[PDB]
Amino acid sequence: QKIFLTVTADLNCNLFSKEQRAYITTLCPSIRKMEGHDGIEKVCGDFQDIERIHQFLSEQ
Amino acid sequence: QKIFLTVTADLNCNLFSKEQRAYITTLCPSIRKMEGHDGIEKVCGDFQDIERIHQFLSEQ
Amino acid sequence: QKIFLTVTADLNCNLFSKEQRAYITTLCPSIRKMEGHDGIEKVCGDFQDIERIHQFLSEQ
Amino acid sequence: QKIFLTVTADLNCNLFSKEQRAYITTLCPSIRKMEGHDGIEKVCGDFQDIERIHQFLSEQ
């Protein structure tokens, strides 16, 4: 089965814009998002999507 | 410059025993954990730690 | 003087409709939310915000 | 049936010592806790229990 049933990550919203963090919807379409007027602040799902999101923000 | 301010993982406690999950606090001594009648169910820390915990459990 | 830095609540999506849970963004404009297929599933914010949400929903 | 399935609160560990925070074990022996070497950082449980902990901490 799965090692991690789910993984959640608090995003740095000082470091990355609404526009940068909004791409996560296209990068990982089935990632669950905690979102404000400030855009995506937390993400939840498979460890593979958290890695993919970390890779993506790491490059910005 | 933290990408993920924190990261939290839900451990699959069906796949892994209390003894197997117990080592996580030696593996990552500054980890934070949530602990029931069958030991460690959830963990919180750096991305690096959650990657090391995934690596470790992945090899059992 | 924050006692709770943030507070997250899991909503009883069986008890309340998408239309009932949808008002939360109008009730609490500054709130953060996570939206599955049947609307808002989880909410993050201030204690006071989570309190007013409990009240609003308790009277449906 | 209940309004909030669970509630989680990030505790202000700057405003409240390890020892003040440790009493939450006595206050709500049923509350699930995220804890490391500065003690309880996050609590998860029933709305009523979150209220009691906020009520306790606010009375300090």
Author numbering:
A (entry chain A), B (entry chain D), C (entry chain B), D (entry chain C): 132 to 191
Sentences from the paper on this structure:
The N‐terminal D1 and D2 domains of DTX3L mediate homo‐oligomerization, and the D3 domain interacts with PARP9, a protein that contains tandem macrodomains with ADP‐ribose reader function. Our results suggest that homo‐oligomerization of DTX3L is important for the DTX3L‐PARP9 complex to read mono‐ADP‐ribosylation on a ligand‐regulated transcription factor.
Using mass‐spectrometry, we identified that the amino acid sequence of the crystallizable fragment started at A126 and ended in Q200. Taking advantage of the presence of methionine and cysteine residues in the protein sequence we solved the structure by sulfur single‐wavelength anomalous diffraction (S‐SAD) using high‐redundancy data collected on the long‐wavelength beamline I23, at Diamond Light Source, UK. Despite the anisotropy, we observe a well‐defined electron density for the protein, for which we determined that the D2 domain comprises three antiparallel β‐sheets packed against two α‐helices. The asymmetric unit of the crystal had four copies of the D2 monomer, and the interfaces buried in this oligomer (973 and 415 Å2) indicate that this could be a biologically relevant oligomer and that D2 assembles as a homo‐tetramer with a 2‐fold symmetry between adjacent dimers. At the main interface there is a hydrophobic cleft that accommodates Ile134 and Phe135 from its complementary chain (left). The smaller interface is formed between the short β2 strands and only two inter‐chain hydrogen bonds are formed. Sulfates are located at the N‐terminus of helix α2 and each of them forms a hydrogen bond with H185.
